[PDB]
Structure 1
Amino acid sequence: AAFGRATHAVVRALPESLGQHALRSAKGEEVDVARAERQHQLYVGVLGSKLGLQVVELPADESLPDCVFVEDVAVVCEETALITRPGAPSRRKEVDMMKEALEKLQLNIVEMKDENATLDGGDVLFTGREFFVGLSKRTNQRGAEILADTFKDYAVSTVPVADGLHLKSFCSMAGPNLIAIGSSESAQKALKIMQQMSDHRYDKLTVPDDIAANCIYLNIPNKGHVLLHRTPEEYPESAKVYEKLKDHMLIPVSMSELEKVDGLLTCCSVLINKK
Protein backbone atom coordinates (compact mmCIF):
# COMPACT_ATOMS: atom_id res chain seq x y z
CA ALA A 1 0.00 0.00 0.00
CA ALA A 2 3.10 2.20 0.25
CA PHE A 3 3.39 4.90 -2.39
CA GLY A 4 5.31 3.77 -5.44
CA ARG A 5 4.88 0.06 -4.81
CA ALA A 6 4.82 -1.84 -8.09
CA THR A 7 4.80 -5.48 -9.11
CA HIS A 8 4.39 -5.20 -12.88
CA ALA A 9 5.50 -2.94 -15.71
CA VAL A 10 4.19 -2.69 -19.27
CA VAL A 11 6.73 -1.50 -21.85
CA ARG A 12 6.84 -1.44 -25.65
CA ALA A 13 9.77 -1.80 -28.04
CA LEU A 14 10.60 1.08 -30.32
CA PRO A 15 10.25 0.71 -34.10
CA GLU A 16 12.89 1.61 -36.63
CA SER A 17 10.53 4.34 -37.85
CA LEU A 18 10.90 6.29 -34.59
CA GLY A 19 14.16 7.82 -35.77
CA GLN A 20 12.59 9.80 -38.62
CA HIS A 21 8.84 9.71 -37.87
CA ALA A 22 8.24 10.10 -34.12
CA LEU A 23 6.66 13.45 -33.29
CA ARG A 24 9.12 15.93 -31.83
CA SER A 25 9.06 19.40 -30.30
CA ALA A 26 11.78 20.87 -32.50
CA LYS A 27 13.99 19.80 -35.38
CA GLY A 28 17.27 18.86 -33.77
CA GLU A 29 19.89 16.12 -33.77
CA GLU A 30 19.69 12.88 -35.68
CA VAL A 31 18.33 10.00 -33.60
CA ASP A 32 20.64 7.00 -33.42
CA VAL A 33 17.99 4.29 -33.46
CA ALA A 34 20.42 1.48 -32.59
CA ARG A 35 21.59 3.45 -29.55
CA ALA A 36 17.98 4.23 -28.58
CA GLU A 37 17.26 0.50 -28.73
CA ARG A 38 20.26 -0.30 -26.52
CA GLN A 39 19.18 2.35 -24.01
CA HIS A 40 15.61 1.05 -24.06
CA GLN A 41 16.85 -2.52 -23.54
CA LEU A 42 18.88 -1.44 -20.49
CA TYR A 43 15.89 0.47 -19.12
CA VAL A 44 13.75 -2.67 -19.37
CA GLY A 45 16.58 -4.64 -17.74
CA VAL A 46 16.49 -2.38 -14.69
CA LEU A 47 12.75 -2.78 -14.20
CA GLY A 48 12.67 -6.54 -14.76
CA SER A 49 16.03 -8.08 -13.95
CA LYS A 50 17.45 -5.65 -11.38
CA LEU A 51 14.22 -4.67 -9.58
CA GLY A 52 12.29 -7.90 -10.15
CA LEU A 53 9.14 -6.46 -11.68
CA GLN A 54 7.12 -8.67 -14.00
CA VAL A 55 7.57 -6.91 -17.34
CA VAL A 56 5.06 -7.17 -20.18
CA GLU A 57 7.01 -6.32 -23.35
CA LEU A 58 4.75 -5.21 -26.20
CA PRO A 59 6.17 -5.51 -29.74
CA ALA A 60 7.04 -2.52 -31.88
CA ASP A 61 4.72 -1.37 -34.68
CA GLU A 62 6.50 0.44 -37.53
CA SER A 63 3.30 2.38 -38.29
CA LEU A 64 3.22 3.79 -34.71
CA PRO A 65 6.59 5.57 -34.42
CA ASP A 66 5.89 6.85 -30.87
CA CYS A 67 4.62 3.49 -29.56
CA VAL A 68 7.56 3.15 -27.12
CA PHE A 69 5.95 5.92 -25.02
CA VAL A 70 3.35 3.69 -23.35
CA GLU A 71 2.79 6.12 -20.46
CA ASP A 72 0.84 8.38 -22.77
CA VAL A 73 -1.81 5.72 -23.52
CA ALA A 74 -2.79 4.55 -20.01
CA VAL A 75 -2.97 5.84 -16.43
CA VAL A 76 -3.17 3.19 -13.70
CA CYS A 77 -4.33 3.83 -10.14
CA GLU A 78 -4.74 0.83 -7.83
CA GLU A 79 -6.73 -1.76 -9.82
CA THR A 80 -8.23 0.66 -12.39
CA ALA A 81 -6.65 1.53 -15.74
CA LEU A 82 -7.79 4.57 -17.70
CA ILE A 83 -7.05 3.97 -21.39
CA THR A 84 -6.46 7.51 -22.61
CA ARG A 85 -7.36 9.32 -25.85
CA PRO A 86 -3.97 10.65 -27.00
CA GLY A 87 -3.89 14.25 -28.16
CA ALA A 88 -2.17 13.29 -31.42
CA PRO A 89 -4.81 11.40 -33.45
CA SER A 90 -2.25 9.20 -35.19
CA ARG A 91 -1.20 7.78 -31.81
CA ARG A 92 -4.70 6.57 -30.94
CA LYS A 93 -4.13 3.15 -32.49
CA GLU A 94 -1.55 2.57 -29.73
CA VAL A 95 -4.33 1.97 -27.18
CA ASP A 96 -5.38 -1.36 -28.76
CA MET A 97 -2.39 -3.43 -27.64
CA MET A 98 -2.28 -1.62 -24.27
CA LYS A 99 -5.93 -2.39 -23.53
CA GLU A 100 -5.28 -6.06 -24.26
CA ALA A 101 -2.19 -6.17 -22.02
CA LEU A 102 -4.01 -4.53 -19.11
CA GLU A 103 -7.07 -6.75 -19.53
CA LYS A 104 -4.82 -9.83 -19.33
CA LEU A 105 -3.39 -8.41 -16.08
CA GLN A 106 -7.01 -8.33 -14.81
CA LEU A 107 -7.28 -4.58 -14.32
CA ASN A 108 -10.64 -2.88 -14.51
CA ILE A 109 -10.58 -0.95 -17.79
CA VAL A 110 -12.11 2.48 -18.39
CA GLU A 111 -11.72 3.87 -21.92
CA MET A 112 -11.61 7.57 -22.83
CA LYS A 113 -13.90 7.56 -25.86
CA ASP A 114 -15.47 11.05 -25.76
CA GLU A 115 -14.72 12.53 -29.19
CA ASN A 116 -14.03 15.92 -27.57
CA ALA A 117 -11.58 14.64 -24.93
CA THR A 118 -7.84 14.22 -25.26
CA LEU A 119 -5.31 13.24 -22.63
CA ASP A 120 -1.68 12.09 -22.72
CA GLY A 121 -0.56 10.10 -19.71
CA GLY A 122 2.64 12.19 -19.74
CA ASP A 123 0.50 15.13 -18.56
CA VAL A 124 -0.63 13.26 -15.41
CA LEU A 125 1.24 13.44 -12.10
CA PHE A 126 -0.14 11.07 -9.45
CA THR A 127 1.28 11.98 -6.04
CA GLY A 128 -0.27 9.11 -4.10
CA ARG A 129 -2.69 11.67 -2.60
CA GLU A 130 -4.16 13.38 -5.69
CA PHE A 131 -3.69 13.95 -9.42
CA PHE A 132 -2.40 17.01 -11.22
CA VAL A 133 -3.17 17.14 -14.94
CA GLY A 134 -1.35 19.39 -17.38
CA LEU A 135 -3.55 21.26 -19.83
CA SER A 136 -1.25 21.17 -22.84
CA LYS A 137 -1.35 20.83 -26.60
CA ARG A 138 -2.11 17.12 -26.07
CA THR A 139 -4.39 17.18 -22.98
CA ASN A 140 -7.56 19.24 -22.69
CA GLN A 141 -10.06 20.07 -19.96
CA ARG A 142 -12.53 17.37 -21.02
CA GLY A 143 -9.79 14.75 -20.75
CA ALA A 144 -9.00 16.01 -17.24
CA GLU A 145 -12.68 15.76 -16.24
CA ILE A 146 -12.95 12.17 -17.49
CA LEU A 147 -9.86 11.23 -15.49
CA ALA A 148 -11.44 12.84 -12.41
CA ASP A 149 -14.62 10.85 -13.07
CA THR A 150 -12.58 7.66 -13.44
CA PHE A 151 -10.65 8.01 -10.16
CA LYS A 152 -13.41 9.47 -7.98
CA ASP A 153 -11.52 8.77 -4.71
CA TYR A 154 -8.82 11.32 -5.60
CA ALA A 155 -8.79 15.08 -6.03
CA VAL A 156 -7.86 16.16 -9.56
CA SER A 157 -6.71 19.68 -10.45
CA THR A 158 -5.24 21.18 -13.62
CA VAL A 159 -2.14 23.23 -14.38
CA PRO A 160 -1.25 25.04 -17.63
CA VAL A 161 1.67 23.50 -19.52
CA ALA A 162 3.67 25.46 -22.08
CA ASP A 163 4.93 24.94 -25.61
CA GLY A 164 5.56 21.39 -26.80
CA LEU A 165 5.83 20.06 -23.25
CA HIS A 166 4.00 17.62 -21.01
CA LEU A 167 3.54 18.19 -17.28
CA LYS A 168 6.14 15.51 -16.54
CA SER A 169 8.63 17.21 -18.89
CA PHE A 170 9.77 19.04 -15.73
CA CYS A 171 8.53 17.07 -12.69
CA SER A 172 7.80 13.61 -11.28
CA MET A 173 7.59 11.91 -7.90
CA ALA A 174 10.96 11.15 -6.29
CA GLY A 175 9.55 9.57 -3.13
CA PRO A 176 6.55 9.65 -0.81
CA ASN A 177 5.35 13.24 -0.56
CA LEU A 178 8.41 14.31 -2.61
CA ILE A 179 8.10 16.07 -5.97
CA ALA A 180 11.18 16.37 -8.15
CA ILE A 181 10.91 19.74 -9.87
CA GLY A 182 12.97 21.73 -12.35
CA SER A 183 14.52 25.12 -11.68
CA SER A 184 13.05 27.05 -14.62
CA GLU A 185 10.59 29.87 -13.97
CA SER A 186 8.07 27.85 -15.99
CA ALA A 187 8.58 24.72 -13.88
CA GLN A 188 8.45 26.79 -10.69
CA LYS A 189 5.30 28.62 -11.82
CA ALA A 190 3.51 25.31 -12.41
CA LEU A 191 4.66 23.88 -9.06
CA LYS A 192 3.36 26.98 -7.26
CA ILE A 193 -0.05 26.52 -8.93
CA MET A 194 -0.10 22.83 -7.99
CA GLN A 195 0.83 23.52 -4.36
CA GLN A 196 -1.79 26.26 -4.01
CA MET A 197 -4.55 23.95 -5.29
CA SER A 198 -3.56 21.06 -3.02
CA ASP A 199 -4.71 20.37 0.52
CA HIS A 200 -1.22 19.04 1.24
CA ARG A 201 2.27 20.42 1.62
CA TYR A 202 4.68 18.43 -0.54
CA ASP A 203 8.41 18.30 -0.03
CA LYS A 204 10.42 19.25 -3.11
CA LEU A 205 13.67 18.04 -4.68
CA THR A 206 14.77 20.87 -6.98
CA VAL A 207 17.05 19.98 -9.89
CA PRO A 208 18.86 22.48 -12.15
CA ASP A 209 17.87 20.74 -15.43
CA ASP A 210 14.10 20.57 -15.98
CA ILE A 211 14.30 17.40 -18.10
CA ALA A 212 16.27 15.65 -15.33
CA ALA A 213 13.31 16.23 -12.98
CA ASN A 214 11.68 13.26 -14.78
CA CYS A 215 12.70 10.20 -12.77
CA ILE A 216 11.06 6.94 -11.73
CA TYR A 217 10.47 6.31 -8.05
CA LEU A 218 9.68 2.79 -6.87
CA ASN A 219 9.15 1.12 -3.51
CA ILE A 220 10.46 -2.43 -3.93
CA PRO A 221 9.99 -5.22 -1.34
CA ASN A 222 13.24 -5.91 0.56
CA LYS A 223 14.87 -2.91 -1.17
CA GLY A 224 12.92 0.16 -0.05
CA HIS A 225 13.18 3.49 -1.87
CA VAL A 226 14.44 3.09 -5.46
CA LEU A 227 14.99 5.88 -8.01
CA LEU A 228 15.91 5.72 -11.70
CA HIS A 229 17.44 9.09 -12.71
CA ARG A 230 19.39 10.55 -15.63
CA THR A 231 23.11 9.91 -15.57
CA PRO A 232 25.97 12.23 -14.54
CA GLU A 233 27.12 12.03 -18.16
CA GLU A 234 23.80 13.47 -19.34
CA TYR A 235 23.01 15.97 -16.55
CA PRO A 236 25.86 16.12 -14.02
CA GLU A 237 24.42 19.00 -11.99
CA SER A 238 21.07 17.28 -11.53
CA ALA A 239 22.70 13.91 -10.81
CA LYS A 240 24.55 15.66 -7.96
CA VAL A 241 21.21 16.59 -6.39
CA TYR A 242 19.84 13.04 -6.60
CA GLU A 243 23.04 11.83 -4.89
CA LYS A 244 21.80 13.41 -1.63
CA LEU A 245 18.94 10.89 -1.33
CA LYS A 246 20.95 8.65 0.97
CA ASP A 247 18.09 6.24 1.77
CA HIS A 248 17.29 5.74 -1.95
CA MET A 249 18.84 3.05 -4.10
CA LEU A 250 19.89 5.30 -6.99
CA ILE A 251 20.10 3.85 -10.51
CA PRO A 252 21.48 6.03 -13.34
CA VAL A 253 19.66 5.30 -16.61
CA SER A 254 20.55 6.86 -19.97
CA MET A 255 17.78 8.11 -22.26
CA SER A 256 19.64 10.64 -24.44
CA GLU A 257 18.38 9.32 -27.79
CA LEU A 258 14.71 9.13 -26.89
CA GLU A 259 14.96 12.58 -25.32
CA LYS A 260 15.44 13.84 -28.90
CA VAL A 261 11.77 12.99 -29.56
CA ASP A 262 10.83 14.34 -26.12
CA GLY A 263 10.47 10.95 -24.39
CA LEU A 264 11.76 10.68 -20.82
CA LEU A 265 12.09 8.02 -18.13
CA THR A 266 8.46 7.85 -16.91
CA CYS A 267 7.16 7.86 -20.50
CA CYS A 268 8.61 4.44 -21.23
CA SER A 269 6.63 2.30 -18.79
CA VAL A 270 3.22 1.84 -17.16
CA LEU A 271 3.66 0.61 -13.58
CA ILE A 272 1.08 -1.54 -11.79
CA ASN A 273 0.73 -2.87 -8.25
CA LYS A 274 -1.01 -6.24 -8.23
CA LYS A 275 -1.29 -7.07 -4.56
Structure 2
Amino acid sequence: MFKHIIARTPARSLVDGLTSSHLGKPDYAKALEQHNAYIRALQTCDVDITLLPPDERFPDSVFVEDPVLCTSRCAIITRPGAESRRGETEIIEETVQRFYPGKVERIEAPGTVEAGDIMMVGDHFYIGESARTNAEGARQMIAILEKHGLSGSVVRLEKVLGLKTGLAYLEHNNLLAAGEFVSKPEFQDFNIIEIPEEESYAANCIWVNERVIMPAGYPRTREKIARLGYRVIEVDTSEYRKIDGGVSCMSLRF
Protein backbone atom coordinates (compact mmCIF):
# COMPACT_ATOMS: atom_id res chain seq x y z
CA MET A 1 0.00 0.00 0.00
CA PHE A 2 1.21 3.43 -1.08
CA LYS A 3 0.78 6.63 0.86
CA HIS A 4 2.77 8.97 -1.41
CA ILE A 5 3.37 9.92 -5.01
CA ILE A 6 5.97 12.27 -6.45
CA ALA A 7 5.72 13.83 -9.91
CA ARG A 8 7.33 16.80 -11.62
CA THR A 9 5.68 19.12 -14.10
CA PRO A 10 6.94 18.75 -17.72
CA ALA A 11 9.55 21.31 -18.80
CA ARG A 12 9.04 23.18 -22.07
CA SER A 13 12.39 21.91 -23.26
CA LEU A 14 10.51 18.60 -23.17
CA VAL A 15 10.45 18.60 -26.97
CA ASP A 16 14.19 17.98 -26.76
CA GLY A 17 13.84 14.90 -24.57
CA LEU A 18 15.94 11.75 -25.04
CA THR A 19 13.99 9.81 -27.64
CA SER A 20 15.28 6.86 -29.63
CA SER A 21 12.50 6.61 -32.17
CA HIS A 22 11.07 8.52 -35.09
CA LEU A 23 7.71 8.83 -33.33
CA GLY A 24 8.06 12.56 -33.75
CA LYS A 25 8.63 15.33 -31.23
CA PRO A 26 6.22 15.75 -28.30
CA ASP A 27 3.79 18.71 -28.15
CA TYR A 28 4.36 20.59 -24.87
CA ALA A 29 0.83 21.96 -24.99
CA LYS A 30 -0.57 18.44 -25.36
CA ALA A 31 1.94 16.82 -23.00
CA LEU A 32 1.19 19.34 -20.25
CA GLU A 33 -2.46 18.30 -20.54
CA GLN A 34 -1.79 14.60 -20.38
CA HIS A 35 0.33 15.14 -17.27
CA ASN A 36 -2.55 16.99 -15.63
CA ALA A 37 -4.98 14.24 -16.49
CA TYR A 38 -2.35 11.91 -15.06
CA ILE A 39 -2.25 13.73 -11.75
CA ARG A 40 -6.02 13.92 -11.49
CA ALA A 41 -6.03 10.19 -11.97
CA LEU A 42 -3.74 9.75 -8.98
CA GLN A 43 -5.82 12.16 -6.93
CA THR A 44 -8.29 9.29 -6.75
CA CYS A 45 -5.84 6.62 -5.55
CA ASP A 46 -5.85 7.51 -1.84
CA VAL A 47 -2.35 8.93 -1.93
CA ASP A 48 -1.09 12.41 -1.38
CA ILE A 49 0.80 14.01 -4.21
CA THR A 50 4.00 15.98 -4.02
CA LEU A 51 4.05 17.70 -7.41
CA LEU A 52 7.42 19.25 -8.18
CA PRO A 53 7.90 22.36 -10.42
CA PRO A 54 9.29 22.20 -13.97
CA ASP A 55 13.00 22.70 -14.47
CA GLU A 56 13.84 23.71 -18.05
CA ARG A 57 17.43 22.54 -17.67
CA PHE A 58 16.25 18.91 -17.83
CA PRO A 59 13.82 17.94 -20.60
CA ASP A 60 13.27 14.44 -19.18
CA SER A 61 13.00 15.56 -15.54
CA VAL A 62 9.26 14.88 -15.79
CA PHE A 63 10.36 11.24 -15.55
CA VAL A 64 11.09 11.32 -11.81
CA GLU A 65 10.87 7.51 -11.79
CA ASP A 66 14.48 7.16 -12.91
CA PRO A 67 16.39 9.61 -10.62
CA VAL A 68 15.46 7.72 -7.42
CA LEU A 69 14.39 4.36 -5.97
CA CYS A 70 11.97 4.58 -3.05
CA THR A 71 11.74 1.56 -0.83
CA SER A 72 9.94 0.83 2.42
CA ARG A 73 13.19 1.15 4.36
CA CYS A 74 15.09 3.85 2.45
CA ALA A 75 15.56 5.77 -0.76
CA ILE A 76 18.49 5.50 -3.12
CA ILE A 77 19.42 8.54 -5.18
CA THR A 78 20.49 6.88 -8.42
CA ARG A 79 23.02 7.99 -11.00
CA PRO A 80 21.58 8.43 -14.53
CA GLY A 81 23.59 6.75 -17.24
CA ALA A 82 22.54 9.53 -19.60
CA GLU A 83 24.52 12.61 -18.50
CA SER A 84 21.97 15.14 -19.68
CA ARG A 85 19.87 13.65 -16.87
CA ARG A 86 22.46 13.04 -14.12
CA GLY A 87 21.74 16.43 -12.55
CA GLU A 88 18.10 15.51 -11.92
CA THR A 89 19.16 13.69 -8.78
CA GLU A 90 20.21 16.97 -7.15
CA ILE A 91 16.99 18.86 -7.72
CA ILE A 92 14.93 16.11 -6.10
CA GLU A 93 17.08 15.10 -3.13
CA GLU A 94 15.46 17.75 -0.97
CA THR A 95 12.05 16.14 -1.41
CA VAL A 96 13.63 12.77 -0.78
CA GLN A 97 15.18 14.03 2.43
CA ARG A 98 11.81 15.25 3.72
CA PHE A 99 10.40 11.72 3.28
CA TYR A 100 13.42 9.62 4.19
CA PRO A 101 15.13 11.68 6.92
CA GLY A 102 18.52 10.15 7.70
CA LYS A 103 17.72 7.19 5.47
CA VAL A 104 18.99 8.38 2.08
CA GLU A 105 21.55 6.45 -0.02
CA ARG A 106 23.21 7.27 -3.36
CA ILE A 107 25.07 5.67 -6.24
CA GLU A 108 28.70 6.77 -6.73
CA ALA A 109 30.69 6.78 -9.96
CA PRO A 110 31.57 5.02 -12.14
CA GLY A 111 28.49 2.83 -11.69
CA THR A 112 25.15 4.12 -12.99
CA VAL A 113 21.50 3.34 -12.32
CA GLU A 114 18.05 4.47 -13.42
CA ALA A 115 15.16 3.25 -11.27
CA GLY A 116 13.28 2.64 -14.49
CA ASP A 117 15.28 -0.58 -14.81
CA ILE A 118 14.00 -1.74 -11.42
CA MET A 119 10.76 -3.60 -10.65
CA MET A 120 9.65 -3.85 -7.05
CA VAL A 121 8.18 -7.18 -6.02
CA GLY A 122 7.57 -7.34 -2.31
CA ASP A 123 10.96 -6.59 -0.78
CA HIS A 124 12.80 -7.80 -3.83
CA PHE A 125 13.91 -5.60 -6.71
CA TYR A 126 14.82 -6.93 -10.12
CA ILE A 127 17.48 -4.80 -11.73
CA GLY A 128 17.69 -5.22 -15.48
CA GLU A 129 21.01 -4.17 -17.01
CA SER A 130 20.86 -1.58 -19.77
CA ALA A 131 22.85 1.23 -21.33
CA ARG A 132 21.57 3.39 -18.47
CA THR A 133 22.21 0.87 -15.68
CA ASN A 134 25.68 -0.66 -15.81
CA ALA A 135 27.09 -3.61 -13.84
CA GLU A 136 28.84 -1.50 -11.20
CA GLY A 137 25.72 0.59 -10.62
CA ALA A 138 23.43 -2.40 -10.13
CA ARG A 139 26.03 -3.95 -7.84
CA GLN A 140 26.10 -0.96 -5.47
CA MET A 141 22.31 -1.00 -5.58
CA ILE A 142 21.94 -4.59 -4.43
CA ALA A 143 24.66 -3.70 -1.95
CA ILE A 144 22.47 -0.95 -0.49
CA LEU A 145 19.24 -2.94 -0.67
CA GLU A 146 20.99 -5.68 1.25
CA LYS A 147 22.31 -3.22 3.82
CA HIS A 148 18.75 -2.24 4.78
CA GLY A 149 17.50 -5.82 5.00
CA LEU A 150 16.33 -5.95 1.36
CA SER A 151 17.11 -8.07 -1.72
CA GLY A 152 17.56 -7.55 -5.45
CA SER A 153 18.50 -9.89 -8.30
CA VAL A 154 19.66 -8.89 -11.80
CA VAL A 155 17.94 -9.52 -15.12
CA ARG A 156 19.52 -9.67 -18.59
CA LEU A 157 18.13 -7.49 -21.37
CA GLU A 158 18.00 -8.72 -24.99
CA LYS A 159 15.64 -6.40 -26.86
CA VAL A 160 13.98 -3.85 -24.52
CA LEU A 161 15.83 -0.64 -23.62
CA GLY A 162 14.73 -0.70 -19.98
CA LEU A 163 13.43 -3.25 -17.51
CA LYS A 164 9.87 -1.99 -16.83
CA THR A 165 9.34 -1.38 -20.55
CA GLY A 166 7.88 -4.82 -21.09
CA LEU A 167 7.04 -5.63 -17.49
CA ALA A 168 4.75 -4.44 -14.76
CA TYR A 169 4.14 -5.98 -11.36
CA LEU A 170 0.51 -5.35 -10.46
CA GLU A 171 0.78 -7.05 -7.08
CA HIS A 172 -0.97 -10.27 -6.15
CA ASN A 173 1.66 -12.21 -8.10
CA ASN A 174 0.42 -10.62 -11.31
CA LEU A 175 2.94 -9.67 -13.92
CA LEU A 176 2.52 -7.94 -17.25
CA ALA A 177 4.98 -9.26 -19.77
CA ALA A 178 5.67 -8.30 -23.37
CA GLY A 179 8.26 -9.34 -25.96
CA GLU A 180 11.00 -11.57 -24.59
CA PHE A 181 10.06 -11.35 -20.89
CA VAL A 182 7.00 -13.58 -21.40
CA SER A 183 9.11 -16.73 -20.97
CA LYS A 184 12.06 -15.35 -19.00
CA PRO A 185 12.88 -18.01 -16.35
CA GLU A 186 13.00 -15.59 -13.40
CA PHE A 187 9.27 -14.90 -13.59
CA GLN A 188 7.65 -18.29 -14.00
CA ASP A 189 6.10 -18.32 -10.53
CA PHE A 190 4.11 -15.23 -11.47
CA ASN A 191 0.73 -15.08 -13.13
CA ILE A 192 2.30 -13.80 -16.33
CA ILE A 193 -0.16 -11.78 -18.37
CA GLU A 194 0.88 -11.61 -22.00
CA ILE A 195 0.75 -8.32 -23.85
CA PRO A 196 0.25 -8.65 -27.64
CA GLU A 197 2.83 -7.02 -29.96
CA GLU A 198 0.80 -4.03 -31.22
CA GLU A 199 0.02 -3.26 -27.55
CA SER A 200 3.50 -3.80 -26.02
CA TYR A 201 3.54 -0.16 -24.79
CA ALA A 202 0.74 -0.98 -22.35
CA ALA A 203 3.23 -3.32 -20.69
CA ASN A 204 4.14 -0.24 -18.68
CA CYS A 205 1.31 0.33 -16.22
CA ILE A 206 1.35 1.11 -12.55
CA TRP A 207 -0.44 -0.45 -9.61
CA VAL A 208 -1.56 2.12 -7.10
CA ASN A 209 -3.51 1.01 -4.06
CA GLU A 210 -5.57 -1.51 -6.03
CA ARG A 211 -6.24 0.91 -8.87
CA VAL A 212 -4.20 0.38 -12.02
CA ILE A 213 -3.25 3.25 -14.27
CA MET A 214 -2.47 2.54 -17.91
CA PRO A 215 -2.05 4.38 -21.23
CA ALA A 216 -5.21 5.03 -23.21
CA GLY A 217 -5.78 3.07 -26.40
CA TYR A 218 -4.72 -0.46 -25.43
CA PRO A 219 -8.07 -2.34 -25.07
CA ARG A 220 -6.94 -5.94 -25.23
CA THR A 221 -4.36 -5.35 -22.48
CA ARG A 222 -6.83 -3.09 -20.75
CA GLU A 223 -9.40 -5.86 -20.75
CA LYS A 224 -7.16 -8.45 -19.12
CA ILE A 225 -6.46 -5.97 -16.32
CA ALA A 226 -10.10 -5.16 -15.57
CA ARG A 227 -10.38 -8.92 -15.81
CA LEU A 228 -8.36 -9.37 -12.60
CA GLY A 229 -10.78 -6.94 -10.95
CA TYR A 230 -8.55 -3.88 -10.75
CA ARG A 231 -10.29 -0.53 -10.95
CA VAL A 232 -8.53 0.27 -14.25
CA ILE A 233 -7.87 3.92 -15.16
CA GLU A 234 -6.85 4.96 -18.66
CA VAL A 235 -4.69 8.03 -19.31
CA ASP A 236 -3.44 9.05 -22.73
CA THR A 237 0.33 9.51 -22.59
CA SER A 238 1.04 9.37 -26.35
CA GLU A 239 3.27 12.44 -26.08
CA TYR A 240 5.53 10.70 -23.56
CA ARG A 241 5.56 7.60 -25.70
CA LYS A 242 7.40 9.79 -28.21
CA ILE A 243 10.34 9.76 -25.85
CA ASP A 244 10.02 6.26 -24.39
CA GLY A 245 8.03 7.49 -21.42
CA GLY A 246 4.97 6.11 -19.71
CA VAL A 247 2.89 6.01 -16.53
CA SER A 248 5.52 4.29 -14.43
CA CYS A 249 8.23 6.72 -15.51
CA MET A 250 6.23 9.79 -14.47
CA SER A 251 6.13 9.15 -10.73
CA LEU A 252 7.66 7.75 -7.57
CA ARG A 253 5.36 5.60 -5.46
CA PHE A 254 5.95 4.63 -1.83
TM-score class, shorter: over 0.9
Does the Cα contact within 8 Å between 1:66 and 1:91 map onto a contact in 2? yes
- Counterpart residue identity of residue 215, structure 1: C
Pair 162,264 (structure 1): closer, same or farther in 2 beyond 3 Å: farther
Give yes or no for contact 1:137–1:163 (8 Å, CA) kept in 2.
no
CA distance in structure 1 between the partners assigned to 2:94 and 2:115 by the alignment: 17
Equivalent-residue separation in structure 2 for 1:41 and 1:172 (angstroms): 23
Distance 2:207 2:35 in 1: 18
In the alignment, residue 203 of structure 1 is paired with which amino acid? N
Kept in 1, the 8 Å contact 2:65–2:252? The answer is: yes
Displacement of 1:163 after TM fit? 5.3
Q: Describe the superposition over 1:79-106 as per-residue Cα deviations: whole angstroms up to 9, x where unpaired.
A: 3000000110121110112110011123
TM-score normalised to structure 1 length: 0.86
RMSD across aligned C-alpha pairs, in angstroms?
1.6
* Local SS of the residue matching 1:71: coil
What is the one-letter code of the residue matched to 2:203? A
Match in the other structure for 1:217: 207
Question: Shift of residue 187 of structure 1?
Answer: 2.9
Higher mean alpha-carbon deviation, 207-216 vs 8-17, is at: 207-216
Q: Which residue of 1 aligns with 2:192?
A: 204
Q: CA deviation at 1:164?
A: 6.4
In structure 1, distance between residues paired with 2:177 and 2:77:
27
Counterparts in 2 of 1:109-120, with a 5 A limit? 109-113=104-108, 115-120=109-114
In structure 2, relative to structure 1, the CA distance for the partners of 1:138 and 1:193 (3 Å cut) is farther
Rate the CA distance shift 1:162–1:64 in 2: closer, same or farther, 3 A.
farther
For residue 145 of structure 1, give the secondary structure of its aligned residue in structure 2.
Answer: helix
Matches within 5 A, 1:45-124: 45-47=40-42, 49-107=43-101, 108-113=103-108, 115-124=109-118
SS of corresponding position for 2:60: coil
Q: Which runs of 5+ in 1 are unaligned?
A: 220-224
Which residue identity is paired with 1:245? Answer: L
The one-letter code of the counterpart of 1:249 is R
Q: In 2, Cα distance between the equivalents of 1:106 and 1:154?
A: 16
Task: Kindly report structure 1 stretches of 4+ aligned residues shifted beyond 4 Å.
Answer: none
Over residues 145-174 of structure 1, what are the superposed CA-to-partner deviations in whole Å (9 max), with x where a residue is unaligned? 111111113332212224561111111111
**Deviation of residue 25 (structure 1)?**
1.3
Is residue 171–residue 210 contact of structure 1 (8 Å, CA) maintained in 2?
no
Equivalent AA in structure 2 for residue 226 of structure 1: R
* Distance (Å, rounded) in 2 between the aligned partners of 1:218 and 1:16: 28
Question: Residues 132-171 of structure 1 correspond to what in structure 2 (within 5 A)?
Answer: 132-152=126-146, 153-162=149-158, 165-171=161-167
The alpha-carbon deviation at position 178 of structure 1 amounts to 1.3
Other-structure match for 2:19: 24
Residue in 1 that maps onto 2:11: 15
Distance in 2, matches of 1:65 and 1:251, equals 26
1:124 shift after superposition: 0.3
Tell me the CA shift for residue 254 of structure 1: 1.4
Contact 2:79 2:114 in 1 (8 A): yes
Aligned-partner Cα distance in 1 for 2:160–2:208? 28
- Corresponding residue of 2:37: 42
Q: Are residues 1:228 and 2:213 paired?
A: yes
Query: Which amino acid in 1 is paired with 2:226?
Result: E
CA contact (8 A) 2:213 2:232 kept: yes
**Seq. identity, %:** 30
Is residue 69–residue 75 contact of structure 2 (8 Å, CA) maintained in 1? Answer: yes
Could you say what secondary structure the match of 2:32 adopts?
Answer: helix
Amino acid at match of 2:201: I
One-letter amino acid matched to 1:143: G
Structure 2: unaligned runs, 5 residues or longer:
none
TM-score normalised according to structure 2 size: 0.92
